[PDB]
Amino acid sequence: TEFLKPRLVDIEQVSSTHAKVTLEPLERGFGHTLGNALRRILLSSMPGCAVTEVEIDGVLHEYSTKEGVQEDILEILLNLKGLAVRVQGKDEVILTLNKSGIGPVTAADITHDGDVEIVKPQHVICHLTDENASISMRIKVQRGRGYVPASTRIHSEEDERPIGRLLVDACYSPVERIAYNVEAARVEQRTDLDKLVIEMETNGTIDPEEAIRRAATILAEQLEAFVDLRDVR
Amino acid sequence: TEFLKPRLVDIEQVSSTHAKVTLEPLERGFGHTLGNALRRILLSSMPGC
Amino acid sequence: GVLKIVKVYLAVKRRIQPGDKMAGRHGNKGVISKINPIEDMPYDENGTPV
Amino acid sequence: GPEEITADIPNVGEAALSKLDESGIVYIGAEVTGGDILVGKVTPKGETQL
Numbered sequence: 001t002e003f004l005k006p007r008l009v010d011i012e013q014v015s016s017t018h019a020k021v022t023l024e025p026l027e028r029g030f031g032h033t034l035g036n037a038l039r040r041i042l043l044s045s046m047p048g049c050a051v052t053e054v055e056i057d058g059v060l061h062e063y064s065t066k067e068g069v070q071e072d073i074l075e076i077l078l079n080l081k082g083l084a085v086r087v088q089g090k091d092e093v094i095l096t097l098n099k100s101g102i103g104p105v106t107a108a109d110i111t112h113d114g115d116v117e118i119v120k121p122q123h124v125i126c127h128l129t130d131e132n133a134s135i136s137m138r139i140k141v142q143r144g145r146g147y148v149p150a151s152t153r154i155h156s157e158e159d160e161r162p163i164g165r166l167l168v169d170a171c172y173s174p175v176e177r178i179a180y181n182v183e184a185a186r187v188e189q190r191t192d193l194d195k196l197v198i199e200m201e202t203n204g205t206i207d208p209e210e211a212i213r214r215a216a217t218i219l220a221e222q223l224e225a226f227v228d229l230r231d232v233r
Numbered sequence: 234t235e236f237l238k239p240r241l242v243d244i245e246q247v248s249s250t251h252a253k254v255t256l257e258p259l260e261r262g263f264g265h266t267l268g269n270a271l272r273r274i275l276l277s278s279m280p281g282c
Numbered sequence: 283g284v285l286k287i288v289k290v291y292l293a294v295k296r297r298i299q300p301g302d303k304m305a306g307r308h309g310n311k312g313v314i315s316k317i318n319p320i321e322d323m324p325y326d327e328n329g330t331p332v
Numbered sequence: 333g334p335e336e337i338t339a340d341i342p343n344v345g346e347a348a349l350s351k352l353d354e355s356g357i358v359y360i361g362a363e364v365t366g367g368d369i370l371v372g373k374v375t376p377k378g379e380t381q382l
Contacts, residue, residue, distance in 0.1 A: 040265065041319070045236070045261075061361040063293050095273065146251055154365065179328055218236055225239055229254065262322060286337060288337065290358065323375070
């Protein structure tokens with residue numbers, strides 16, 4: 001006669017990275033109709049906070065070498081693009097990394113902030129090769145959507161002079177891999193209904209339930225215009 | 234964070250039964266996710282007698 | 283005739299865009315046509331795009 | 333006459349001269365794009381007859 005709405009059942013975490021959420025009450029074929037449409041919005045327009053601007057000590061540009069570190073500055077910038085962090089009430093925060101002495105500099109050697117959560121304290125930023133070699137750096141992290149390469153981030157100019165502010169490419173996004181599988185779920189009485197097993201993969205900076213909601217949020221907002229059609233211009 | 238909702242949408246009808254709507258601007262890839270998910274529900278799960 | 287010369291060295295970083303020529307080792311040339319979102323990318327059952 | 337590398341260039345603003353030092357040569361590390369001045373240079377031409 002009329003219709004049936006779904007809901008999320010067990011969201012089974014496996015790793016901080018990857019997990020399996022499930023949606024039980026799906027009518028015929030809606031598991032596919034959703035799973036791809038959700039995969040679409042899941043992989044792309046999900047908010048994430050990735051490092052943007054990095055100003056270091058003795059370095060004018062990304063093409064130099066710091067005396068005392070076996071990583072070229074360019075390679076250290078690249079390591080940062082893969083640093084996974086999460087903030088809460090700040091939309092951009094600048095982290096100060098300080099360390100010296102022979103050994104690896106991980107992501108746990110930074111300075112903690114109220115909103116700072118380092119999801120991978122073992123993540124390698126660079127090594128340090130000489131007893132009294134010291135590195136201080138200002139790391140500017142912002143939050144956003146999509147992929148903003150460092151190139152498109154030079155048109156506002158208007159005196160971004162600080163010669164030592166090295167921009168990196170913005171990867172803003174948590175999602176790594178999204179896969180959905182629909183196996184037929186029979187609730188005891190209905191002819192045939194289906195399940196939705198959505199298997200995702202994450203950088204550990206977003207919990208599954210938060211994500212899938214804001215995902216679905218955008219949908220009706222885009223369908224909003226879609227419902228009635230005022231021929232607007 | 235915040236998102237894009239389109240504007241300018243012209244439905245030029247060719248008879249009461251058939252029509253071509255067009256709706257721009259949609260962010261990256263949102264054209265298929267909508268276009269397909271609605272094609273899905275129109276052809277498949279729509280009520281009719 | 284030359285009094286002084288200033289040689290400046292620029293390091294440009296170019297990535298990839300439609301029009302670059304790419305080929306495998308087997309003599310298959312190619313010119314990248316479109317740069318596609320991961321959303322439109324073909325994926326296998328496990329969900330890993332290509 | 334001889335050509336000068338001086339930072340004094342007819343008809344140019346400070347935004348141009350921003351990226352330049354006192355001597356007329358771009359600082360090391362200044363990221364630049366099309367049209368930016370790498371080296372200030374000036375050649376003598378007297379009594380233009382405008």
